[PDB]
Amino acid sequence: AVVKCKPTSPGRRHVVKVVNPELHKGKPFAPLLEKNSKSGGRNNNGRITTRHIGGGHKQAYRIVDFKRNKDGIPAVVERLEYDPNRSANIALVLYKDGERRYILAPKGLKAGDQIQSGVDAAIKPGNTLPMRNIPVGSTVHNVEMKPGKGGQLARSAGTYVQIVARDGAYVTLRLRSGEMRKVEADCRATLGEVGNAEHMLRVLGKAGAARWRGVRPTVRGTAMNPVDHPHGGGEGRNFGKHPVTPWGVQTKGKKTRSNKRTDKFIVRRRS
Amino acid sequence: MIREERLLKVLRAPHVSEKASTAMEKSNTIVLKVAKDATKAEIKAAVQKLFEVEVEVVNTLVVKGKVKRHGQRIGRRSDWKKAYVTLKEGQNL
Amino acid sequence: MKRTFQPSVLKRNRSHGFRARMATKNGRQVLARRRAKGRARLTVSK
RNA sequence: AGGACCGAACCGACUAAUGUUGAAAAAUUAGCGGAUGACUUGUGGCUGGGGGUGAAAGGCCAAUCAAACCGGGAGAUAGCU
RNA sequence: GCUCGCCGGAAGACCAAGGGUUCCUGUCCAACGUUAAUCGGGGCAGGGUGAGUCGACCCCUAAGGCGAGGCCGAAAGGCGUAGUCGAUGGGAAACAGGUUAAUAUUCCUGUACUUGGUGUUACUGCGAAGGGGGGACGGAGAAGGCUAUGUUGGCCGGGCGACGGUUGUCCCGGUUUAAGCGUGUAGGCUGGUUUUCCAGGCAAAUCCGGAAAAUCAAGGCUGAGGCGUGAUGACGAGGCACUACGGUGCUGAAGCAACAAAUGCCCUGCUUCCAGGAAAAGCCUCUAAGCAUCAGGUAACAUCAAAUCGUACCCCAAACCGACACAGGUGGUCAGGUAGAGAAUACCAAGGCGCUUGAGAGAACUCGGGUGAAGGAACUAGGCAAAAUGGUGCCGUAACUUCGGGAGAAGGCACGCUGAUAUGUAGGUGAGGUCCCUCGCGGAUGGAGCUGAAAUCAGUCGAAGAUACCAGCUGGCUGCAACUGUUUAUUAAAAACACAGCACUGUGCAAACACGAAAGUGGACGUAUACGGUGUGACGCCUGCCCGGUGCCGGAAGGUUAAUU
Ligand SMILES: [Mg+2]
Ligand SMILES: [Mg+2]
Ligand SMILES: [Mg+2]
Ligand SMILES: [Mg+2]
Ligand SMILES: [Mg+2]
Ligand SMILES: [Mg+2]
Ligand SMILES: [Mg+2]
Ligand SMILES: [Mg+2]
Ligand SMILES: [Mg+2]
Ligand SMILES: [Mg+2]
Ligand SMILES: [Mg+2]
Ligand SMILES: [Mg+2]
Ligand SMILES: [Mg+2]
Ligand SMILES: [Mg+2]
Ligand SMILES: [Mg+2]
Ligand SMILES: [Mg+2]
Ligand SMILES: [Mg+2]
Ligand SMILES: [Mg+2]
Ligand SMILES: [Mg+2]
Ligand SMILES: [Mg+2]
Ligand SMILES: [Mg+2]
Ligand SMILES: [Mg+2]
Ligand SMILES: [Mg+2]
Ligand SMILES: [Mg+2]
Ligand SMILES: [Mg+2]
Ligand SMILES: [Mg+2]
Ligand SMILES: [Mg+2]
Ligand SMILES: [Mg+2]
Ligand SMILES: [Mg+2]
Ligand SMILES: [Mg+2]
Ligand SMILES: [Mg+2]
Ligand SMILES: [Mg+2]
Ligand SMILES: [Mg+2]
Ligand SMILES: [Mg+2]
Ligand SMILES: [Mg+2]
Ligand SMILES: [Mg+2]
Ligand SMILES: [Mg+2]
Ligand SMILES: [Mg+2]
Ligand SMILES: [Mg+2]
Ligand SMILES: [Mg+2]
Ligand SMILES: [Mg+2]
Ligand SMILES: [Mg+2]
Ligand SMILES: [Mg+2]
Ligand SMILES: [Mg+2]
Ligand SMILES: [Mg+2]
Ligand SMILES: [Mg+2]
Ligand SMILES: [Mg+2]
Ligand SMILES: [Mg+2]
Ligand SMILES: [Mg+2]
Ligand SMILES: [Mg+2]
Ligand SMILES: [Mg+2]
Ligand SMILES: [Mg+2]
Ligand SMILES: [Mg+2]
């Protein structure tokens, strides 16, 4: 649910939090955890290559099964869990042979639900089928781009794609951005939407809450000296120039895609 | 075991001081200067063989040499090893 | 006031010690220059 | 509960006086701000000079910074003293 | 040596880092020491650091480093796989007393413990570079049970007071004891056992995971503290003997209880929240290949081993970083009494110091303070500085407001001591006794003893009872910035930066973008409810017109137009 905090301090006045009572309260399932230490946005040269990254809470990586290739064996949802690594929630499922896995939690999924994958799976949320077995017009998530590679599109909270058309070896998809794309009809998809659609209603409320997520402050280009940014300089507040990135590339409207390999699969750009 | 040549080389001198005399007269302990590289076992065996006494235990420490001034020229004495050899309470070296 | 030299034997050895000089070509040229000049203390180790 | 409140340790540095060949190449005394946090601190590590890093002051990068330090080109050039 | 003064959450005692002989003894006083020096962290000589259990070394890993082959690069080299290093983290084991001029958990006495080797005996399915379990983990909060520790009483030894009193409800001192071993308590977690089966755990598995029956309903694990032993021991006030007057030798009483109580322990617990909280080995278990009356494994006994290196001393400091015997800086641990909320503050204990120039005098003036007639901001750029306010309990409190605030608004009243209520109350703690039971560190009852606020009434002293130290000045109007934060180390702390929020825009994943001749890496083990850039800057009401100029986006008929030919 979406809960507004009471203004007992100036840092709580504008906080809006989303609380799910049915998320698990205990510890995560240990065999499916790994460490991931932080980078600070630094690469193997040690230089900052992405600005504004650093700090935040310690996190443990949960191994999520994006491939869903355990065909023919039904599974049962045991519990929903909080995942610090992504915006969606994950579900712990238990197969009849006794193996446990994490999957992205689709909307409406709850403990005790039946899921399975394969060509013969029923058309109901949480089931994974090759997209040539999924009716046209269906809403799916966790979509593969190359068969067997694992889901890559529509993975964050609340998103989905719609199967618009099917023409032989390809299906046409409408992506959240509005782009129309073709993928092989053998790529897998999971029925339904990614849950946790309220994620975008949260309001952080204070600076520290952004620092808790590993985001460091952004300094505006106009606030610097000309040696530091193309926008820098001036006696008082002066701009007088076309907006650019810190490396001098126009930043309001100029297009940057240049990939002639994959141009064939874009039916229509997002507009 | 340890050859006789090694044993003939490990022991250097007996250490003479007030603390050494007190050690002998109160707790039946010999204080010796030994080779820097002599281990406890070598010292034990050497005292058993050359002095013909049965020993109980050996305790060792390394003494660091003092930095001295020999007329405006700086020098340093060498480190050496000191062993406290506890005889077996009836030996009377 | 905190001053600039804050001693640490481990950091001293890892930064300027003999094995650090010997691990790169430029460090070995440092050693070669110091030997050519005739330095008594070749690095910080001694 | 809380980037909540008062307040020591701890971290700062707003005012005044002193000091200014100082006790000190930035402090002392009396007050002063934060004090469960975007906090503070030890140990180790990484980022190298037109480069780093910067909640941005051209700040900081060993008492050095609108381009560190050391050596070399090098006895640069000096219609100037 | 006797007095005086100072610190006592340090100016005491330890550890780590750093230093390296500064430690102790004898001797010397030239130079060093801001003066003298018989003294010294100074000179010279000698002495001094003792470990199976403490640390390192060692086994194991983090960030990161190096990196066989490899990929890439004019060369030099860059990155990285298998590996191998790397603690600030995980991994076996010792305590009390005594002793030196100087070391001691290391030496001595007493009492313990750990790991491994070898041998004997008895029984026996052992085996990993593989599987599973475990190790193994956040913030805050709340108690309950305890201990360290303290206070009082009892007991023991001593005393009877330089000046009125002091055989008593009097004074002084002591009243200590460890690890280990046994017990398994307050309390925390978890149903247990047997059988059968299985697409899982790269193969196998009797292990783990899953499924189905039967049966029992109590088993298991963890666990401070107490108690017993350790200990008929040690220590012990003091006394008696040597003293060569520094200290040595001998002997040795009591050694209990109640109450209070941690920030320490149970507790890696419990409750709760979101920002969702290392790794690997040691350890336990399962098998594979293999071995197969061997090897190997388990247990008991005996025996052997546990090497090497550090160990002195300083360590909020005269020994470390500041050129100095320098008002500076320096991580962790310990933490007594009275008052106090307290680790603030005041006075003290243990312990340690009087800061390495003194002696006089008692001018101006400077510095740091005390008091001040009448006036009370007239000072000044400006109430700068100073003065003032200051505690607890209760009463009471405006506009405005985002309904939380404003607010400790403002303002006011009480406050010491003594007696009674009540020879010490409400409360807390809790012995004996009594009664039960699955008998124990049990349950119920029981209230001796100990401890003990707050209030009311009456009295009483002073000018004054929050008496010292300590400890908000308050109110009104207005600019700016929402707010907590950040910043010019060393003349600027702000209205500057950031910020939550808003908008635009790029980006379909081998993403855009960034570092990189490249290989790669970050973005991200993320996937448009995501990520980057740019501007604005909570919230409320809002955000009007202009596309001519410059930029960007789209178009591609025409004109112009490169290499090429
Ligand atoms: Mg950003
Ligand atoms: Mg922003
Ligand atoms: Mg500026
Ligand atoms: Mg520019
Ligand atoms: Mg202007
Ligand atoms: Mg203009
Ligand atoms: Mg011994
Ligand atoms: Mg030793
Ligand atoms: Mg606060
Ligand atoms: Mg600062
Ligand atoms: Mg200032
Ligand atoms: Mg101050
Ligand atoms: Mg405040
Ligand atoms: Mg405060
Ligand atoms: Mg400027
Ligand atoms: Mg500087
Ligand atoms: Mg230049
Ligand atoms: Mg030239
Ligand atoms: Mg010249
Ligand atoms: Mg000396
Ligand atoms: Mg001395
Ligand atoms: Mg003289
Ligand atoms: Mg002198
Ligand atoms: Mg001396
Ligand atoms: Mg590594
Ligand atoms: Mg490499
Ligand atoms: Mg190679
Ligand atoms: Mg290793
Ligand atoms: Mg360590
Ligand atoms: Mg000592
Ligand atoms: Mg007690
Ligand atoms: Mg010592
Ligand atoms: Mg001095
Ligand atoms: Mg000093
Ligand atoms: Mg500090
Ligand atoms: Mg104090
Ligand atoms: Mg005077
Ligand atoms: Mg004056
Ligand atoms: Mg006054
Ligand atoms: Mg007077
Ligand atoms: Mg007056
Ligand atoms: Mg008056
Ligand atoms: Mg007046
Ligand atoms: Mg005036
Ligand atoms: Mg005037
Ligand atoms: Mg003032
Ligand atoms: Mg005042
Ligand atoms: Mg005005
Ligand atoms: Mg502000
Ligand atoms: Mg400044
Ligand atoms: Mg990539
Ligand atoms: Mg602005
Ligand atoms: Mg407008």
In short:
This is part of a larger assembly, with chains A (271 residues), B (93 residues) and C (46 residues). Chain B is built from three helices and six strands.
Protein model, in words:
Chain B: InterPro entries: Nucleotide-bd_a/b_plait_sf (IPR012677), Ribosomal_uL23-like (IPR013025), Ribosomal_uL23/eL15/eS24_sf (IPR012678), Ribosomal_uL23_CS (IPR001014). Chain B: Keywords: Ribonucleoprotein, Ribosomal protein, RNA-binding, rRNA-binding. This is part of a larger assembly, with chains A (271 residues), B (93 residues) and C (46 residues). Chain A is mainly beta and 271 residues long. Chain A folds into 3 domains: 1-113, Beta Barrel (OB fold (Dihydrolipoamide Acetyltransferase, E2P)), CATH 2.40.50.140; 117-194, no CATH class; 195-271, Ribosomal protein L2, domain 3. Chain A is built from 1 helix and 17 strands. Chain A has one helix at 207-211, and strands at 2-4, 16-18, 33-35, 60-62, 75-81, 90-95, 100-104, 114-115, 128-130, 139-141, 143-144, 151-153, 161-167, 170-174, 180-184, 188-191, 266-268. In chain A, a hairpin with a 2-residue loop joins strand 13 (161-167) and strand 14 (170-174). By secondary structure, chain B is α+β, with helices and mostly antiparallel strands. Chain B has one domain: 2-Layer Sandwich (Alpha-Beta Plaits). Chain B is globular and about 50 Å long. The two termini of chain B are 24 Å apart. Chain C has one domain (1-46): Helix Hairpins (Orthogonal Bundle), CATH 1.10.287.3980. Helices cover 54% and strands 0% of the residues of chain C. With 46 residues, chain C is mainly alpha-helical. The chains hardly touch. One magnesium ion (MG) is lined by residues 226, 230 of chain A. One magnesium ion binds next to loops of chain A. Chain A binds 2 RNA strands through strand 12 and helix 1.
